[PDB]
Design a protein around this ligand. Structure first.
Ligand SMILES: [Mn+2]
Ligand SMILES: [Mn+2]
Ligand SMILES: [Mn+2]
Length: 107
């Protein structure tokens, strides 16, 4: 709700990635609805995911990604995490800042 996402798209998207090692971020952002929202909402989701308010999505926070969507969601695998961080962290600091995050969703 935090990023104006609908219950039904979140339900459907978790359905597909229910299973270990099956998460694909790009497919998820599309299905959950995030790829078609405004930049502003893309930013509020960003700041939701950054649980510690550091201004960056640290790797440990990227691992509990799904949990922001649903409390009973699984943590991502290290393989899933690495893959996500590979795509998102273009400045090579090992963290995802707001601008990288936003940019990665623009696909
Ligand atoms: Mn953080
Ligand atoms: Mn932390
Ligand atoms: Mn970075």
């Amino acid at each position: 709700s935090f990023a104006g996402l609908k219950d039904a798209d979140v339900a459907a998207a978790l359905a597909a990635c229910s299973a270990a090692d099956s998460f694909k971020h790009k497919e998820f952002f599309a299905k959950v609805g995030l790829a078609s929202k405004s930049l502003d909402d893309v930013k509020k989701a960003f700041y939701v995911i950054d649980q510690d308010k550091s201004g960056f999505i640290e790797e440990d926070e990227l691992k509990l990604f799904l949990q922001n969507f649903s409390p009973s969601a699984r943590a991502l695998t290290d393989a899933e995490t690495k893959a996500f961080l590979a795509d998102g962290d273009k400045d090579g600091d090992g963290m995802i800042g707001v601008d990288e995050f936003a940019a990665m969703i623009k696909a």
